[PDB]
Every structure is written in C-alpha cells, then in structure tokens.
UniProtKB/Swiss-Prot annotation, chains A, B:
Catalyzes the NADPH-dependent reduction of beta-ketoacyl-ACP substrates to beta-hydroxyacyl-ACP products, the first reductive step in the elongation cycle of fatty acid biosynthesis. Substrate binds at residue 144. The lineage of its organism: Bacteria, Pseudomonadati, Aquificota, Aquificia, Aquificales. This is 3-oxoacyl-[acyl-carrier-protein] reductase FabG. Pfam families: adh_short_C2 (PF13561). Keywords: Fatty acid biosynthesis, Fatty acid metabolism, Lipid biosynthesis, Lipid metabolism, NADP, Oxidoreductase. It comes from Aquifex aeolicus (strain VF5). Homotetramer.
Length: 248, 248, 236, 236
C-alpha cells in the first residue's frame, strides 16, 4: 500500500538543486532522514532546513566538493557525528565540461572523471559501513541516456555515464551476499530551471526525440529512485532503469 | 506515500497460479479491480473469488486459452460486459515446450509463438480501447532473463521472450502520444510451487548463478509490475526492468 | 585472404536486395551458393547469373517460407545437389507495415510465420553436415528496429528482436560442436525498394544509407576464419 | 583480400599479449606498425622482431599512459617517423584487482588514468591525418566484464564500460569525416598471464579460451573494407 522510509537515513549527493534536490525531497516525503550535499555548505544547510520545514524530517546539509578527497572524507566525519550511519546512497552528483573531442582540454576530461567516477567511488566507499553491518542497503547511481547512446560534445560525460554501469554491475555482484542492492537510473531529457536557457527551436528539437513528446520532471526521476529504495525492489540489483519517455 | 489503484481495472493473463496470481494479488492489494484468466474458467472464477475475499476487491474470472483467437475474443465479450474497460494489462500468460533444437517439433515451436507472441498481440489489441480514449494506460509484458541470455533447450521460448522486447519498444513508440505506457519485466529464477519438482543438486546449481544467492519470490516480481502501474513510473516507457537478483 | 572454396552456402530470399548481395559476396570468396526465392524460376535465373559472373557452382531452388511443404521439397532438391550445407544465411523476411491499432491478425501472423517459423524450419534442415564435421556458420539477418522498435512495425520488430533470442540460444546449444551462430543487424540500407520512397538519413551519423554489399561484407566476415571466437553475437 | 599496405597503425601496449597479436595481425595484412610499451627498449625490440617476421616498416616507442609528458614525447617521435596515423588500436590497459571494500584510491585512480585518460590523450594525438583524408579507424579494446561486471574488478569494469560511452560518442563526432570508431570486447583469452592461474572455461559455450590471434582477427576486420558501414559498435 505505502512506501515508508521512516528510520532510514538517505544521503543524496549534489542535492541543493535540480534532480538531486527532487530526489532528496521525494525520499523525505516517504519519511527518510536526508543528507543534502553541495559545493556550498551554506546552501546545503539552507536546502536541508527548507526540506525539514516542508516535510518535517530530520535533515542535515554538508559541504562536499567531489573534486576533493579531503572535502569528501571531511563531509563524512560530519555525517557520522550526526547519524548512526547511511542506509541509502544516491550518487547523483555529476558535472559536464562539454567540448568537441579535439577541443577538450585534459582538465575538461579529468574533472568530469574525477567527479562522476572517482567522486562516486569515494562517496560509496564512505557510505557502506552500516549497510554491510545490517545486511540491508540501497545504492542508486544516476547515469544518463547519453551513457548508452553517446552524444556529440560529451565524450567525457558519456564515458563516465557508461562507466557507472560497469561500476553498478560489478559492485552489485560484490555486495549481493550482504543484501546491499546496487542499481542505476538513466534519465533522458529532464526539465530543470536550467532548461529555461535553451532556445525554443532546439528545445523543440530535443522534445522531438521523445515519444511521450515532453521532457520529464525532476520528480519523475525521483520517483524511480524512491522505487529502488523501497520494498518493491528487493530482487533488483545490478540493473539500470531507463527513465526517458521512450527515447531508448 | 501510498500506491493506490482504486477505480482502475487490471487484466492479468494466466493468473490462476504462480507469478500471474501473485501479480493479480499485488494489484488487488493496491485496490485495483482484477480480472483473472486461465485455460479453465472454473479455476479462474475460483481464484477471483479467493482474491475478492482476501482483499475485498471487485474480481472477475474468465476462461481464456491463448492458443485460440475465438477463446480470447469471447473472453473479452464477457470482460466488457462486466467492466467499463481495461486501464492496466499485464501480459503474463506464456508457455514453454522445451526441446533441444533439432528435436523440437513444429508444433513445439508454433505453440510457444502462438501463446507468447500472438496471444500477447491479440490480448493487447483487445485491451487498448479505454486506455487510448482516456489517455492513460499501462501495458506490462512479462519477458524473461532467457530472452536476453539465451538458454539451451529453449530456442522457442527465448525467441518469444526476446521478441516481446521488440514488441514492447515498438508499441511504446506508437502509443506514447496517447500516454499509454508499454514496458517489460524480465524475471530471473523465481521460486514457484513447481520449483519443488527440481533436484536439490540442480536447484543449487541455479542458485549459484544468482549473486543474491536466492530465488526471487513471485511477490517480488509482482512488486515491480505494481511499480510500472503506479504514478512512480509516469516517465518510463519502452523499458525492460530486469528482476533477477544480479544475474544479468 | 578470405576464401570459401569447397564450402556450400545457403542464402534464403536471395533473388534480390540484401539477400542477392550476400550470395554474390560469398560467391566472390569462392563459396558454392544456393539461391532461394518464392519463384523457383527466378531463383534459378539468379543462380545462373551469379555462376556466370563469379564462376562458382550455384543452384536455385523455390522455397516459400510460409509453407512447410515448400521448405521440405526445397531441401530434398538441395540434398540431391550438394553433400550438405556448411554456411546458412537466414536472410528471407517480409514486412506488413501497419499501425498497431490497424493491424490484422494476418498482418501479424504472416510476418511471424515467415520471419521466425520459416527461419526455424530452414535452420533445422541445414545443420546435419555442420554438426558432423564440427564446423558451421549460421548468420541471422535481424534489423536495427528489433533493438530500437519502430512505429508501424510492431510485427516486424517483434520478429527481428525474436531472432536475437533465437541466435543466442542456438549458439549455446551448438557451441560444443563448433557451429557458430550470429546475427547481423543492418540499419537503413539502400536497395531496390528505396527508390519508391533525407529524413531517415538524418538519423545516421555517417550521413548516408549503407549499401547491400556493406551488409554482405559483414556476413562474409562471420563466415570467415576471422570470426572463429564469435558466437551468440549481433553485429550492428 | 584484406590489405593494409600503405596504412600506418598505432597499437598501444603491444610489446606482449593481445596487443602484440594485434600488431602482428595488422603487419601480416601489410600495415606499417607502431609498437608502444612502458619500456622503449622493449618496444623497439618487438618492432624489430615484427619487421623481421613480416617484412614491414615497424617502429617502437616508449609510451607510459600514466604520463602526459611520456605521451607527448612519444607522439613527437612518431610524427618524425611517419606522415601520420591511419589506424589506432587503443589496447593498453591495466588491472589492479581488489574487492571494493579493500580498494585504495590509488588502486582506483591508476586504472582510470591509464585505461580511460591514457586512451583519451592517445586518441586526441592520433586523429589529424584521419580527419584530413576522411578515412580512419579507431578500435578500443574493452572487455566482457565491462558488460557483465566482475567481482574484484569494480575499477577495471568501470573503465571497460566507460570505453563503450567513449566509443559511441566519438563515433558520432567523427562520422561526418568517415572516421569509424568501434570497440572489441574480448571474453577470456589465453595469454602469457594465463599460465600463472577449467572454472572460467565452464562459463564459455565454446568450452575453450580464445587466442590472442582470434581477438586480433576481429580488430583486423574493423580496420578493413568489410567494416565500412560499422561505427559506434562493440563486437563481442
């Protein structure tokens, strides 16, 4: 009947805005304690406070810059002083540095790998303790349709979004004996506040790629993450769920 | 918070036992009116009555032999006299006729295609009316991990379970403009009452293919079908969700 | 450097189009070829043309994949002409394009019977020599739309996806006998049928339709020594 | 029938194993070959051996994929030896196998830096001639474990899956210039490293490990005229 996560603690990286924020709010709506992260601790704490006021949940904001190992490990010291541990991890944080391939600087490439892959690696390693101990955990990695299709100007980003699938399937196999389930969600074209910057022409060209004829909302992505964190997904691990309105 | 299907009508083919029955009970548990089908009308009506008593839902049983077009169309005449129409269709019904390839009779092959593919085609065609009219519908096709991996002795069955993926992706594109979402669920190794017939040795050999180290329950499959019928899956169409404990 | 002299290849539906290109490609590598079509006279004429062009042993047989009887008769003839088949290319296929809501049972069932059941029966009849000698290649022609789906093609896409399950399963069964089973999935290919139609082309990064010979070349690769460790695979 | 005379192929990490087999295969088809290894002396020795065996123009260069400086120096040398590169085989790769819960940041970061970032930089440096002439082949060596995942290999599997995104994206960007970008995903292959290990073999329908030459043959196909309509594809 209902999906309840009262008593669970969910960490959602890069959740001060956009899809990450929608994911944190969705988990909060189900009763989860939530941990909000951003490159600004002030903004993360502000967002946590707004979520706590809206849904009445225990919420904590931490500064976490996924470019920095020191920032990540320091964030976890603050986290483990506030909660017993983490039951649910959503590896949402990610960046793009879009350039045509020959025009892509080494820094453009390495930053995208550092955040999207190495950041995910470090955050996941940091989050497993309570999950392994109690033989229950959910890790949800946010991929992208472009990890599957490829995309012009995003060889770096697409490499990471595809790489997260290998990450997901391998980690799922390793953690399966401990009942810690590791899955991916691969959104298509999602409307966020940043969509407002696109021209009506190209925005229409994008919508034309989508059988449903509309962009998805951040909440529609968040709904699938919630499913994966719920008792409805107890036999799903090593899987990617595409959420793209029929594009792929 | 909750998944409610009160006011919806779900048809689940081949739902007098096993996974099909678990799917019908799960939808019933969420408040859906359910239609139960089997090759025996008496058994289908008996199962419907048991489900109605357990969950308190409106339930109807119809005889439907998916080997027969006449049986299917006749079943729908009874259905449309009992309900306004169908909002949710789960194409669960399927058969195997396992033979090594050179040893497979034409009837072994054609029966499997007739039920698994043509039966699905006919049931789906029969069920769309209300969905298209109201611009809301969910069709869930039950595939199998073997549609993806292949399996010795099941060239016929695997052909159909793979074919259902093409069916799903094509139909999803056609119906997307009407907001009728078409998806597949691909179970792995699921424990049913028929599992009791296997030797402990081979049953163990199967479990060894599964990272979670256990067979899934019919209810765990039913849970994923429910997700696809719920408001949590509003941006998912043309997708297959694997439910196999990490096998694939 | 790819030579198939001494091999016998059966290519179904090879009187025209991609099928003809595959048969000519195999012939160009030295294979004996068996051409099939719904018209035995046409199949024989095409075989004669290929034999004249490439200098190979070529035979034409009538084979209508809708009919078990047609298939049986064709194989009786085949096995009176060759010792057996080393290479099978399941190319024969049909479309009956209709929006799902306008699709008849016949629109559906004919496409399955030819594309799946015809393939099944042809394949069953083609394995004897391959299993005995522990060498054989079966190549199933699928389609990109089996993977992506396509509007107006729920029936065809079902069959082309189904052929993937068929390929993977059969590959597993035959692998102990070193009989390799693979699929080729062409995108948009310029054939005789294309002339009766820029748009579809906009979906293609290469910005052009493929030629039948380009598909044929991939079939040739799969029949070659270069593909000795590939089985249960789809080449797009 | 596959000839690469006049073509120049760069094969990274080709002093031994699958890399060496690929370089020898290309050489056997007539390609000029560039051999790389972390040891320039070893790379040069292997190039000399290949040149002696096949009669081709072969060059060995030191290239350590961890170091941008090493890569730059190697390409400076390369472009003083050849007009440019027509074929690139991104073969170089490392494993640092550890259970995830025992994996160090270095176990992780080294594997990404070599397998992904090294591939990135090598590829950027190899495109000039291909784009100019509107012909080129880039073949990325992935692995079955990129698709299935593997216990003890979360780092390696991440890179091998990532190379698929890399392949598909780069293929889309380069397709207008007719530069084709594909991946080969080997299963379990018997190499020099195998001897230090029936089980893994039980997962293989063919019931045997593949040879390095069998992988090399598929790379050769992708570099050939037979693969002219294949781009953004993985061959397993």
């Amino acid at each position: 009947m209902e999906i309840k996560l009262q008593g669970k603690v969910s960490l959602v990286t890069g959740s001060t805005r956009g899809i990450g924020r929608a994911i944190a709010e969705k988990l909060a709506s189900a009763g989860s304690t939530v941990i909000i992260t951003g490159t600004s601790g002030e903004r993360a704490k502000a967002v946590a406070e707004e979520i706590a006021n809206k849904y009445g949940v225990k919420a904590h904001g931490v500064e976490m810059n996924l470019l920095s190992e020191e920032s990540i490990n320091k964030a976890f010291e603050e986290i483990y002083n506030l909660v017993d541990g983490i039951d649910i991890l959503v590896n949402n944080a990610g960046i793009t540095r879009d350039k045509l391939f020959l025009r892509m600087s080494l820094l453009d490439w390495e930053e995208v790998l550092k955040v999207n892959l190495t950041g995910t690696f470090l955050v996941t390693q940091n989050s497993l303790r309570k999950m392994i101990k109690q033989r229950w955990g959910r890790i949800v990695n946010i991929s992208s349709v472009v990890g599957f299709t490829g995309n012009v100007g995003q060889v770096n980003y697409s490499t990471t979004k595809a790489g997260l699938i290998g990450f997901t399937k391998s980690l799922a196999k390793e953690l399966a004996p401990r009942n810690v389930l590791v899955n991916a969600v691969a959104p298509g074209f999602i409307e966020t506040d940043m969509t407002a910057v696109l021209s009506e022409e190209i925005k229409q060209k994008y919508k034309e790629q989508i059988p449903l004829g509309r962009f998805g909302s951040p909440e529609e992505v968040a709904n699938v993450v919630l499913f994966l964190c719920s008792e409805l997904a107890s036999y799903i691990t090593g899987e990617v769920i595409h959420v793209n309105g029929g594009m792929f």
